[PDB]
Design an enzyme around this catalytic site. Structure first.
Site, PDB file in Angstrom:
ATOM      1  N   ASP A 104      -1.623  -2.148  -7.311  1.00 43.53           N
ATOM      2  CA  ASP A 104      -1.948  -1.904  -5.905  1.00 43.53           C
ATOM      3  C   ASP A 104      -2.021  -3.222  -5.138  1.00 43.53           C
ATOM      4  O   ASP A 104      -2.994  -3.970  -5.269  1.00 43.53           O
ATOM      5  CB  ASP A 104      -3.262  -1.136  -5.801  1.00 43.53           C
ATOM      6  CG  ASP A 104      -3.652  -0.828  -4.368  1.00 43.53           C
ATOM      7  OD1 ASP A 104      -2.797  -0.968  -3.468  1.00 43.53           O
ATOM      8  OD2 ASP A 104      -4.820  -0.448  -4.144  1.00 43.53           O
ATOM      9  N   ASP A 154       1.599  -2.405   0.981  1.00 42.70           N
ATOM     10  CA  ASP A 154       0.581  -1.632   0.273  1.00 42.70           C
ATOM     11  C   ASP A 154       1.249  -0.689  -0.724  1.00 42.70           C
ATOM     12  O   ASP A 154       1.752   0.371  -0.341  1.00 42.70           O
ATOM     13  CB  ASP A 154      -0.272  -0.865   1.276  1.00 42.70           C
ATOM     14  CG  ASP A 154      -1.425  -0.135   0.627  1.00 42.70           C
ATOM     15  OD1 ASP A 154      -1.784  -0.473  -0.524  1.00 42.70           O
ATOM     16  OD2 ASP A 154      -1.976   0.778   1.273  1.00 42.70           O
TER      17      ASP A 154
HETATM   18  C1  LIG Z   1      -4.681   2.448   2.738  1.00 45.54           C
HETATM   19  C2  LIG Z   1      -5.544   1.623   1.822  1.00 45.54           C
HETATM   20  C3  LIG Z   1      -6.076   0.423   2.620  1.00 45.54           C
HETATM   21  C4  LIG Z   1      -5.842  -0.861   2.127  1.00 45.54           C
HETATM   22  C5  LIG Z   1      -6.312  -1.979   2.820  1.00 45.54           C
HETATM   23  N1  LIG Z   1      -6.042  -3.244   2.274  1.00 45.54           N
HETATM   24  C6  LIG Z   1      -6.734  -4.381   2.601  1.00 45.54           C
HETATM   25  O1  LIG Z   1      -7.577  -4.509   3.474  1.00 45.54           O
HETATM   26  C7  LIG Z   1      -6.377  -5.536   1.779  1.00 45.54           C
HETATM   27  C8  LIG Z   1      -7.191  -6.652   1.873  1.00 45.54           C
HETATM   28  C9  LIG Z   1      -6.852  -7.753   1.092  1.00 45.54           C
HETATM   29  C10 LIG Z   1      -5.735  -7.683   0.263  1.00 45.54           C
HETATM   30  C11 LIG Z   1      -5.369  -8.799  -0.547  1.00 45.54           C
HETATM   31  N2  LIG Z   1      -5.075  -9.711  -1.202  1.00 45.54           N
HETATM   32  C12 LIG Z   1      -4.988  -6.512   0.243  1.00 45.54           C
HETATM   33  N3  LIG Z   1      -5.285  -5.425   0.991  1.00 45.54           N
HETATM   34  C13 LIG Z   1      -7.010  -1.814   4.018  1.00 45.54           C
HETATM   35  C14 LIG Z   1      -7.248  -0.529   4.511  1.00 45.54           C
HETATM   36  C15 LIG Z   1      -6.781   0.585   3.813  1.00 45.54           C
HETATM   37  F1  LIG Z   1      -7.007   1.817   4.294  1.00 45.54           F
HETATM   38  C16 LIG Z   1      -6.664   2.539   1.271  1.00 45.54           C
HETATM   39  N4  LIG Z   1      -7.262   1.947   0.097  1.00 45.54           N
HETATM   40  C17 LIG Z   1      -8.544   2.052  -0.337  1.00 45.54           C
HETATM   41  C18 LIG Z   1      -8.636   1.310  -1.496  1.00 45.54           C
HETATM   42  C19 LIG Z   1      -7.359   0.749  -1.753  1.00 45.54           C
HETATM   43  C20 LIG Z   1      -6.516   1.163  -0.741  1.00 45.54           C
HETATM   44  C21 LIG Z   1      -5.112   0.901  -0.496  1.00 45.54           C
HETATM   45  N5  LIG Z   1      -4.297   0.441  -1.492  1.00 45.54           N
HETATM   46  N6  LIG Z   1      -4.684   1.132   0.713  1.00 45.54           N
END
Ligand SMILES: C[C@@]1(c2cc(NC(=O)c3ccc(C#N)cn3)ccc2F)Cn2cccc2C(N)=N1
Length: 377
Positions: free
Chosen positions: A223, A38
């Site tokens: 991201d 992430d």
């Molecule tokens: C920590 C945070 C986060 C990311 C996620 N990611 C997925 O579920 C996810 C799902 C699919 C792909 C792909 N192909 C990539 N990721 C899940 C929980 C979370 F809390 C918060 N957040 C809010 C909007 C963007 C973000 C981010 N960058 N990280």
């Protein structure tokens, strides 16, 4: 400057649409966990109490190297939240750079709408900078600690492949076998998110023709924790109108363009060529130079599992917080997060999905004047 990082090739896995994760171990003896990669966050947060969607979690009482920092942390998101207890442990990446480092760990003890049922990841590796770490910037992120404690170069690179999913996270280097062509670098505008500047947008070569500040209002970031290419309201509306016009040989319901309905074709007969390519021009390293990255409908039409039909979801959507270059963008490319030289490199990914007649592309240079104006000051 590049080379072979053979142990880290193909170390990423994921389920289609739920996140790319790397295997890591925490504690002594090592406890294995799958951790979401992430670039849009900065905490190393791992599930550390039972949860119906977690089939394993971090058990601090079984780790002889655990140290309790004796401080809670509460992290709300727009949709979802978690709460946890701060501490440290020894951390490794088995298919990684062959070093073990002591790192801060947010042991998640309570959460709501954060863990995804069936995602197969039990935590998140936030690779962004300290400025957005919770509770504040005194909690050093994982990568900062890894570089300080080892001889690993202050750089990582991501190849997300898409079409179940897989890829590579090269810690400390650039693997030459994961891209073709040149690597083109855009500056990291500010060290918090990985913020970049878009200077021009095209749909099948046709300029979208807006004030270039609109492309970066109020920020443009890269991201890996987001699926979609997310665009500001005014940019999204212009982009969708142009994509509709270019693909007008077939008409689709309005709900398709909102991401709410799937469009299907007979298996193998998906008409990629009637859909346009999408180009983002990024600020270059030289004065008045830009390069452009170009993705295909194979990137922004995302497959969703009648077995005799291939069906897809439109994965360009609206954002209230600026542009998010998510997996839709990154899956076309090998992306180099060069923290040492405060720049982000892009190159045509060697594993990206395409057809016999079109590929994703990274091309440059282009004379683009007044590029600093494009930044939302
Ligand atoms: C920590 C945070 C986060 C990311 C996620 N990611 C997925 O579920 C996810 C799902 C699919 C792909 C792909 N192909 C990539 N990721 C899940 C929980 C979370 F809390 C918060 N957040 C809010 C909007 C963007 C973000 C981010 N960058 N990280």
């Amino acid at each position: 400057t590049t080379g072979s990082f053979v142990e880290m090739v193909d170390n990423l896995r994921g389920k289609s649409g739920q996140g790319y994760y790397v295997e890591m171990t925490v504690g002594s003896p090592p406890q294995t966990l799958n951790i979401l990669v992430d670039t849009g966050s900065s905490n190393f947060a791992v599930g550390a109490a039972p949860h119906p969607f977690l089939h394993r979690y971090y058990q601090r009482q079984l780790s002889s190297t655990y140290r309790d920092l004796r401080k809670g942390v509460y992290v709300p998101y727009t949709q979802g939240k978690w709460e946890g207890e701060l501490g440290t442990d020894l951390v490794s990446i088995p298919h990684g750079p062959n070093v073990t480092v002591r790192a801060n760990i947010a042991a998640i003890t309570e959460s709501d709408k954060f863990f995804i049922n069936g995602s197969n990841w039990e935590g998140i590796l936030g690779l962004a900078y300290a400025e957005i770490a919770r509770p504040d910037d005194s909690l050093e992120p994982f990568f900062d600690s890894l570089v300080k404690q080892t001889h690993v170069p202050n750089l990582f690179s991501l190849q997300l492949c898409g079409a179940s999913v897989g890829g590579s996270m090269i810690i400390g280097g650039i693997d030459h076998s994961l891209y073709t062509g040149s690597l083109w670098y855009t500056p990291i505008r500010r060290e918090w998110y990985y913020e970049v500047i878009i200077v021009r947008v095209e749909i099948n070569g046709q300029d979208l023709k807006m004030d270039c500040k609109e492309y970066n209002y109020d920020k443009s970031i890269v991201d890996s924790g987001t699926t979609n290419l997310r665009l500001p309201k005014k940019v999204f509306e212009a982009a969708v109108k142009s994509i509709k016009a270019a693909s007008s040989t077939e008409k689709f319901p309005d709900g398709f363009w909102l991401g709410e309905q799937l469009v299907c074709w007979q298996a193998g007969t998906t008409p990629w060529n009637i859909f346009p390519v999408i180009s983002l021009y990024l600020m270059g390293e030289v004065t008045n130079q830009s390069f452009r990255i170009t993705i295909l409908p194979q990137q922004y039409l995302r497959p969703v599992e009648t077995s005799q039909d291939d069906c897809y979801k439109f994965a360009i959507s609206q954002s209230s917080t600026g542009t998010v270059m998510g997996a839709v963008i990154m899956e076309g490319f090998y992306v180099v997060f060069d923290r040492a030289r405060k720049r982000i490199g892009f190159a045509v990914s060697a594993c990206h999905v395409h057809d016999e007649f079109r590929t994703a592309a990274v091309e440059g240079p282009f004379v683009t004047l007044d590029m600093e104006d494009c930044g939302y000051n």
